[PDB]
Amino acid sequence: PSPRTIAVTSGKGGVGKSNVSLNFSLSLSKLGFRVLLLDMDIGMGNIDILLGESSSLALADWFSARLPLSELVKSGPEHLSYIAGGTGAAQWQGLDTASIDRFLTELQAVASQYDYLIFDMGAGASGERLYFLKSVDDVFVVTTPEPTAMTDAYAMMKYMHAAGSEAPFSVIVNRAGKEREGYEVFERLKHVTGRFLNKDIALLGIIPEDRTVARAVVSQTPFVLLDPAAKASKAVRQMAFRYAPRFFAKLRQLFLER
Numbered sequence: 001p002s003p004r005t006i007a008v009t010s011g012k013g014g015v016g017k018s019n020v021s022l023n024f025s026l027s028l029s030k031l032g033f034r035v036l037l038l039d040m041d042i043g044m045g046n047i048d049i050l051l052g053e054s055s056s057l058a059l060a061d062w063f064s065a066r067l068p069l070s071e072l073v074k075s076g077p078e079h080l081s082y083i084a085g086g087t088g089a090a091q092w093q094g095l096d097t098a099s100i101d102r103f104l105t106e107l108q109a110v111a112s113q114y115d116y117l118i119f120d121m122g123a124g125a126s127g128e129r130l131y132f133l134k135s136v137d138d139v140f141v142v143t144t145p146e147p148t149a150m151t152d153a154y155a156m157m158k159y160m161h162a163a164g165s166e167a168p169f170s171v172i173v174n175r176a177g178k179e180r181e182g183y184e185v186f187e188r189l190k191h192v193t194g195r196f197l198n199k200d201i202a203l204l205g206i207i208p209e210d211r212t213v214a215r216a217v218v219s220q221t222p223f224v225l226l227d228p229a230a231k232a233s234k235a236v237r238q239m240a241f242r243y244a245p246r247f248f249a250k251l252r253q254l255f256l257e258r
Contacts, residue, residue: 003114005136005247009121011152016174017142021120027240029078036114039085041122052220058084063091069106092128134165135251142172170204182206205239
């Protein structure tokens, strides 16, 4: 059995992506779906910190101390499952053909028990990230209305597209401030991807500037949980609501193309 697979990504940092990943994941879980969030980024502790959970086991431990993957699944609120990160580029580069198979086989065994497998990707398309971005069923790219964030979102989509990713691109405009600013960015992005890449892109949703988000992060309770009525919380809940009604093959093939 295979879960639907989503890669959440951005062009460069400073866009609030990981926070958006966790909150979106929780929302989907709140609908009733079995969700597994994998932190594929370089930063140690994020999901756990965001959940008030103490750091312990992480994906990085599968590399260094050869722990099984299944051993690394943790429980979140709302029956969300996750695996924490802290894996570096040097870890992906050193992989054996035998070790990649071990990874994909362990991952497939774990993931078979979930409806959605969500990858919280590190920024950009470099190295192994490209393989994941070209294997998943959906790619969510997170951006802000800030004109430097938008330029990086375009470069990012052009990259993924030029590199042969056939997944649908959906945009999340975070920190809008709105109301129509959220739309103006999207529509602008949409015109230029359509014209120059001949790639059609969807708008997953707009998350308004909201004080609840900073309160949520500093007090380590995810915003949707903390304040389901906040403007940001309603927004993210709507994204999950609107979104919900052969991954390992492509991924294997791409990893072994050398």
